């Protein structure tokens, strides 16, 4: 069907995610991401349902691979926090989708006379809290957005949200790596039955 | 909200969605009537009479067992008081405040609340007369309510 039997995660990915403490959120829970949270922790820390994290991740990868088949440059991935600069750059390397690592200039999506006027068809943001500028410009240019949201994040101007930890380098590096691996798999460039050559430590900061 | 002050409380009772008697209740209506009429002779208000049955005899609602309300049963048995229960308890409060007001002439919050209490009495008496419960010759007098409400 639309979610065939081949897209379920292997036990290793769930093994890896717990090893990178992806499932652990923050203390305060936003109303929008109550569904993703499974149960409050012992120390009042949100614990995300890892199955729902993967289901959103594959769906996000399917959307990205659809646009990126024809024109990879129409996907823009921004990473405000320094713990995601390497991950976003590595994503740019293996997919060809334009990446923004440093500070996001407020107007690079709307100022057409500006020399860095970039017209995307999709935006990926590592953190709605940090990259609010890229998020808010999507409301002026008619562009859907994908975000890696923690339990405290504001789910405004985002359309596909990936509930995960997005503070620790292990959590940030893994999700970008897993997103890139799944993007290529949908693209067909990577057989689903074989192991990717590049390991996660290449994405870590 | 409340009639006179700006308070707004929703403290209520929640009748269950079962108009019939519960399965575990096996007492017949004759035992309920005889016990409830025995309490009526002891000089107990119908609001309190039903409570005693609910707490002690497990008869929480009387319309569920006998099919008729508490006041209607007492009217049939002749134990219904001449002055309705809610009007009597309001006249008892007005007398109580007025007695305190005799020695304490400088109390201006008791004079304000006595005004509110007596306005309630004239609102209820107006309703009961239209409902034919009270004869039109009834009238609340502070020089008279002391004896009838004692």
């Amino acid at each position: 069907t639309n979610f065939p039997d081949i897209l379920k995660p292997s036990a290793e990915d769930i093994k890896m995610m717990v090893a990178c403490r992806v499932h652990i959120g923050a203390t305060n829970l936003n109303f929008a991401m109550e569904e993703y949270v499974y149960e409050r922790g012992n120390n009042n820390e949100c614990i995300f349902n890892l199955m729902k994290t993967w289901e959103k991740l594959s769906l996000a990868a399917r959307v990205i691979a659809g646009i990126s088949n024809e024109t990879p440059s129409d996907v823009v991935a921004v990473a405000g926090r320094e713990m995601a600069h390497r991950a976003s750059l590595k994503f740019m390397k293996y997919t060809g989708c334009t990446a923004v690592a440093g500070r996001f200039t407020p107007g690079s999506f709307t100022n057409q006379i500006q020399k860095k006027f970039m017209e995307p068809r999709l935006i990926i943001v590592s953190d709605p809290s940090v990259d609010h500028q890229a998020l808010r410009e999507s409301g002026y240019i008619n562009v859907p957005t994908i975000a890696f949201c923690n339990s405290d994040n504001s789910l405004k101007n985002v359309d596909i949200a990936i509930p995960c930890n997005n503070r620790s380098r292990l959590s940030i590096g893994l999700m970008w790596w897993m997103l890139t691996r799944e993007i290529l798999r949908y693209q067909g460039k990577l057989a689903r039955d074989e192991k990717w050559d590049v390991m996660v430590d290449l994405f870590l900061h | 909200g409340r009639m006179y002050n700006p308070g707004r409380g929703i403290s209520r009772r929640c009748i269950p969605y079962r108009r019939s008697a519960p399965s575990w209740l096996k007492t017949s209506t004759l035992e309920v009537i005889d016990e409830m009429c025995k309490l009526a002779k002891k000089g107990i208000a119908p609001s309190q009479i039903g409570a005693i049955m609910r707490d002690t005899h497990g008869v929480g609602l009387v319309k569920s067992v006998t099919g008729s309300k508490v006041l209607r049963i007492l009217k049939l048995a002749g134990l219904a008081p001449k002055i309705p229960e809610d009007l009597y308890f309001l006249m008892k409060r007005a007398v109580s405040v007025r007695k305190h007001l005799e020695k304490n002439k400088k109390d201006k919050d008791a004079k304000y609340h006595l005004i509110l209490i007596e306005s309630k009495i004239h609102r209820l008496t107006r309703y009961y007369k239209s409902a034919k419960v009270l004869e039109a010759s009834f009238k609340y007098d502070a020089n008279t309510a002391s004896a009838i409400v004692s």
């Binding site: 639309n2 569904e35 769906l59 399917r62 859907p144 101007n157 949908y186 693209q187 689903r192 | -």
Partner: protein, 83 residues
Amino acid sequence: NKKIELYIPRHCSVTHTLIAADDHAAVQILVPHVNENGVILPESTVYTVKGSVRKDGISDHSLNRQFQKDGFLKTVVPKNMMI
């Protein structure tokens, strides 16, 4: 003779209301279909979200109901909200 309407407008997939010509926050998400091997297909399912829906911070949940309805997600939205 000449056509009455200048154009036939789109309907938001969440609120089932028209998308104004000036609504500059209205997105359009294309979800391609996959074959049995997980490799996507040229065809896709189109989704539309009105501008006001996105700004309230509710478009993500509203889409999840639609994604789950069409089968792209299976165990995301619980039963009591699957309306």
